[PDB]
Design a binder for this molecule. Structure first.
Ligand SMILES: NC(=O)c1ccc[n+]([C@@H]2O[C@H](COP(=O)([O-])OP(=O)(O)OC[C@H]3O[C@@H](n4cnc5c(N)ncnc54)[C@H](O)[C@@H]3O)[C@@H](O)[C@H]2O)c1
Ligand code: FES
Ligand SMILES: [Mg+2]
Ligand SMILES: [Mg+2]
Ligand SMILES: [Mg+2]
Ligand SMILES: [Mg+2]
Ligand SMILES: [Mg+2]
Ligand SMILES: [Mg+2]
Ligand SMILES: [Mg+2]
Ligand SMILES: [Mg+2]
Ligand SMILES: [Mg+2]
Ligand SMILES: [Mg+2]
Lengths: 161, 70, 96, 46, 86, 108
RNA sequence: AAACUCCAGUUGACACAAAAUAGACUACGAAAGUGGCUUUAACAUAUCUGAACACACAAUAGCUAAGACCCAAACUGGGAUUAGAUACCCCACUAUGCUUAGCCCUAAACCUCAACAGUUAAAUCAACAAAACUGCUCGCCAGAACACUACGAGCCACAGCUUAAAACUCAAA
C-alpha cells in the first residue's frame, strides 16, 4: 500500500514545530502535492525502518535490496499503464536480475538478514534453472507423453502388486 | 577490402534466387512430403516409448498432435 | 635556500570569459530579450556564431523562443516591430 | 527557514474568500516581464 | 497565413531606388539562408545524403578557418630581408 | 508541484473577464490546487490570428496563474480549458522559479 | 507533346501528414534509433567477465486485420525520345511511407576498433587504417571455391530466417 497523501515529505519530517503550522502549509509539504519520487522515498524509509537493523546505513546489501525493490515496484506500476514501453521493460527485467544477484549474495553471507528481507519485502527467492534450452513443440509433447506413460505404468504395477 | 568476394556473394545469391523461383512448385511438394515423414517419425518415436514401457496401446486420452502441419 | 620557487596556482590567471547572458534567467515570457536573437526580417533564430552566446544559454534561448512562439507570446515569421529599436547584441549586418 | 518562508508566504494566497477582491485587484494591475540586454551584459528595464 | 502582412521579408525603397532595395532584399534572404532553403527544397534530399553534406560543410569550414589562421600568422615574417647578403 | 498557467482570454469587458478568471481559479481549486497569485500581463494584439471555438481572435488578454497542484490535476485542468469558450489558449507549464539556476564559470 | 480548364491569381476558413531557423551544437539511449510545444511516468547494478539457441529488444523493406490520405512513390497506364527505350525526361495513379493490435527478425545493423583494468616505458612500428602495448575474460578463426549452398533441427516465418557440411576441382586464393 502507498503512504497516505497527507504524509509529510521526508525532508520536512523532523524540522522542529512542523505540527504547529497551518493546514495549507501541511498540504504544501505533503505527498499530495509532490511527484512520485517523494512517495518512493517515503516507501524506502518505511521499509528500512521495518527491516534493517540500522536504518541509517544505506550502503549495506539489505539497504540496496530495499531500494532496488522500491525501484522495481515503480517500474511495474509504470508498465501496467505503458504496455509498449520496451525501454522500461528492459529496466524492470535488469533490476529484477540485479536484485536476484544481491539476494544470492545475502543468502550466502547473512541468512538471518536474508530471511528478514524476504519476509518484509514479500520476495520469494527461487533457484535458477540448471539448463537453458528451448522447449520446442516436439520436446514438450514427448515429455508430456513420457509423464503419462510413467503414470500408466505405475498404475499397472500397483494393480500387479 | 576485397570487393570480388562481395560480387561473388551477389552472383551466387542472385543465381540461387532464380532457381527457387523456377522450381518453386516442385519445392513445395517436397517440403510437404518431408513434413509428412517428419510427423510419421515423431509418432513412431512416441509409439516406441509407450510400447517399450509395457503398455499395449497409448495412455488413455492421449492423441499425438500434429506439431509440423502449418 | 629560500629563493627556490614554491608550488602554487597561477595567481595571474585571468577569469574565464562569460557570455552576455551568464547568470541571468531566460524566461519564455520575456519576449523583449528573446527578440534580440532572431532575424528582423524572417524571425529565424541566429546561430551562436552570431549571438556569441555559450552553448547552455544558446540552448536556453532556443527553447524559450520555441515555447513563446507556440504558446502565443511571440511571432514566428518576423521579429515583433515593437522591439526593432532595442540594443543590437548580434554580430550581423544586412547593410540595410 | 524553508518552512518559515512558506508560512509567511501562505498569508497572501488566493483563497475562496478573497477570490473576488484579488481578481479585481489583478484586473486593476499590470505586470511586465520584458527586459533587454546590452552588449556589455547590462539589463535595461522597460 | 495567420500572421500580419507586410512585416516579414519587407523592404522599403529610399528615394525611388528600387534596384537597391531589391538587392538588399536578396542579400537578406541569402544571409538568413532562405534562398538556400528554397533551392534545396525543390527535390527531396535523402537523410543520409543530408547528413553527409552537413558533415562535409562543417569540416570544410573548420579546415579553411585553420588554414587562414596559419597563413595570417606566417604573414608577419613576410617583409624586406634584414640580413641581405649574409 | 508548482505550476504556472499562461492564459490568453477573449478580449472582453471587465465584468466578463472577471467572471472568466473567477471560473478558471475555481476550477483550479476544485481540482485540488492552492492558488498563490494572479498576474495580469495586459491586453495586447496576438502575435498571430488564433482560431478557437469557431471564432477568430486578433487581440487577447494575457494572464498568469501561479499555483500548487497534484500531478493528476494538470491533465484534468487541461481538458477544462479546452471547453471554456472565453479561453483563446491555455498552457500549464512547470513554474520557472522552481527550475534551478545552475552557476557557470564561463566559457572553457 | 500529352494533361487540366469543377483551370489560374488575391483573400478567408481549414489535417490521423512531417516537424525551416536553432544545429558552425555533438547531446540522450544497450543498440536500433532519437532534433515542433506542454505535462505525467521515467533512463538497472556501490567488483569485473559471462549465451546464434535462455530472457528481453532490434533501421528500412515485408506480411495479417481495421482506419486516415496532403505529399511522395515500387508497380500500372498515357506523352515524348531512340535503330530499338515498357530505362533515363513529362503527366496520372496504386501497394507502401502514417494510427491501432499482431507478426516477420534482416542491413556497409560499421568507429569495418569485443568487455573490464593498466602503462607511455621501451626496439615506436611489416604496410595502410585509427600512436604502441600489457593483464584478464568471453566469443570466434585454421588455403580457395563448392557455400549467405545441400541435408538435419528450431522458428507465427511456407519463394522465409538461424545453425551449417561433404563429394568433385585447383596451386594457389
Ligand atoms: N548449456 C547449458 O544449459 C549450460 C548450463 C550451465 C552452464 N553453462 C555454461 O555456459 C557455457 C556455454 O556452454 P555451451 O558451449 O555448451 O552452450 P552452446 O552455445 O553450445 O548451446 C547449447 C545450449 O546451452 C545454452 N547456452 C549457451 N551458452 C550458455 C551460457 N553461457 N549459459 C547457459 N546456457 C548457455 C544454449 O541455450 C543452448 O541451449 C559453458 O561454459 C557452460 O559451462 C551452460
Ligand atoms: S558563459 Fe556562463 S552561462 Fe554562458
Ligand atoms: Mg554482465
Ligand atoms: Mg556458445
Ligand atoms: Mg543473429
Ligand atoms: Mg523490425
Ligand atoms: Mg496511397
Ligand atoms: Mg560506417
Ligand atoms: Mg562481450
Ligand atoms: Mg543474409
Ligand atoms: Mg531444411
Ligand atoms: Mg537458408
Amino acid at each position: 500500500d502507498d503512504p497516505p497523501p497527507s504524509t509529510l515529505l521526508k525532508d520536512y519530517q523532523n524540522v522542529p514545530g512542523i505540527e504547529k503550522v497551518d493546514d495549507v502549509v501541511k498540504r504544501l509539504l505533503s505527498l499530495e502535492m509532490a511527484n512520485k519520487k517523494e512517495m518512493l522515498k517515503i516507501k524506502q524509509e518505511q521499509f528500512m525502518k521495518k527491516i534493517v537493523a540500522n536504518p541509517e546505513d544505506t550502503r549495506s546489501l539489505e539497504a540496496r535490496i530495499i531500494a532496488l525493490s522500491v525501484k522495481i515496484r515503480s517500474y511495474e506500476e509504470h508498465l501496467e499503464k505503458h504496455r509498449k514501453d520496451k525501454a522500461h521493460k528492459r529496466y524492470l527485467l535488469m533490476s529484477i536480475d540485479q536484485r536476484k544477484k544481491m539476494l544470492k549474495n545475502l543468502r550466502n553471507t547473512n541468512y538471518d538478514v536474508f530471511e528478514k528481507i524476504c519476509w518484509g519485502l514479500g520476495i520469494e527467492y527461487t533457484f535458477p534453472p540448471l539448463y537453458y534450452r528451448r522447449a520446442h513443440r516436439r520436446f514438450v509433447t514427448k515429455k508430456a507423453l513420457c509423464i503419462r506413460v510413467f503414470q500408466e505404468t505405475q498404475k499397472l504395477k500397483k494393480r500387479r502388486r | 577490402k576485397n570487393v570480388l568476394k562481395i560480387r561473388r556473394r551477389k552472383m551466387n545469391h542472385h543465381k540461387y534466387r532464380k532457381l527457387v523461383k523456377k522450381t518453386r512448385f516442385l519445392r513445395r511438394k517436397v517440403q510437404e512430403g518431408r513434413l509428412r515423414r517428419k510427423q510419421i517419425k515423431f509418432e513412431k518415436d512416441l509409439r516406441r516409448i509407450w510400447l517399450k514401457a509395457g503398455l499395449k496401446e497409448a495412455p488413455e486420452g492421449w492423441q499425438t498432435p500434429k506439431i509440423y502441419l502449418r | 635556500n629560500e629563493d627556490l620557487p614554491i608550488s602554487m596556482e597561477n595567481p595571474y590567471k585571468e577569469p574565464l570569459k562569460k557570455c552576455i547572458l551568464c547568470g541571468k534567467h531566460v524566461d519564455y515570457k520575456n519576449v523583449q530579450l528573446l527578440s534580440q536573437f532572431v532575424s528582423p526580417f524572417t524571425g529565424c533564430i541566429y546561430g551562436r556564431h552570431i549571438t556569441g552566446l555559450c552553448g547552455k544559454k544558446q540552448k536556453e534561448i532556443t527553447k524559450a523562443i520555441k515555447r513563446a512562439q507556440i504558446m502565443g507570446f511571440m511571432p514566428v515569421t518576423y521579429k515583433d516591430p515593437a522591439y526593432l529599436k532595442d540594443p543590437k547584441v548580434c554580430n550581423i549586418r544586412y547593410r540595410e | 527557514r524553508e518552512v518559515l518562508q512558506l508560512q509567511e508566504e501562505v498569508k497572501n494566497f488566493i483563497t475562496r474568500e478573497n477570490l473576488e477582491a484579488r481578481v479585481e485587484a489583478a484586473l486593476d494591475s499590470r505586470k511586465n516581464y520584458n527586459w533587454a540586454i546590452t552588449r556589455e551584459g547590462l539589463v535595461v528595464r522597460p | 497565413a495567420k500572421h500580419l502582412k507586410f512585416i516579414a521579408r519587407t523592404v522599403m525603397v529610399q528615394e525611388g531606388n528600387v534596384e537597391s532595395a531589391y538587392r538588399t532584399l536578396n542579400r537578406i534572404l541569402t544571409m538568413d539562408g532562405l534562398i538556400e532553403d528554397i533551392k534545396h527544397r525543390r527535390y527531396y534530399e535523402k537523410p543520409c545524403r543530408r547528413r553527409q553534406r552537413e558533415s562535409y560543410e562543417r569540416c570544410r569550414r573548420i579546415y579553411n578557418m585553420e588554414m587562414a589562421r596559419k597563413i595570417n600568422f606566417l604573414m608577419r615574417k613576410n617583409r624586406a630581408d634584414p640580413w641581405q647578403g649574409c | 508541484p508548482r505550476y504556472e498557467l499562461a492564459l490568453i482570454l477573449k478580449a472582453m469587458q471587465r465584468p466578463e473577464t472577471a467572471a472568466t478568471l473567477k471560473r478558471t481559479i475555481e476550477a483550479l481549486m476544485d481540482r485540488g490546487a492552492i492558488v498563490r497569485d494572479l498576474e495580469n500581463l495586459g491586453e495586447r494584439a496576438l502575435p498571430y490570428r488564433i482560431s478557437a471555438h469557431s471564432q477568430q481572435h486578433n487581440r487577447g488578454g494575457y494572464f498568469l496563474v501561479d499555483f500548487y497542484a497534484p500531478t493528476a490535476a494538470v491533465e484534468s485542468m487541461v481538458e477544462h480549458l479546452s471547453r471554456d469558450i472565453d479561453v483563446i489558449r491555455g498552457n500549464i507549464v512547470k513554474h520557472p522559479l522552481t527550475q534551478e539556476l545552475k552557476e557557470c564559470e564561463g566559457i572553457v
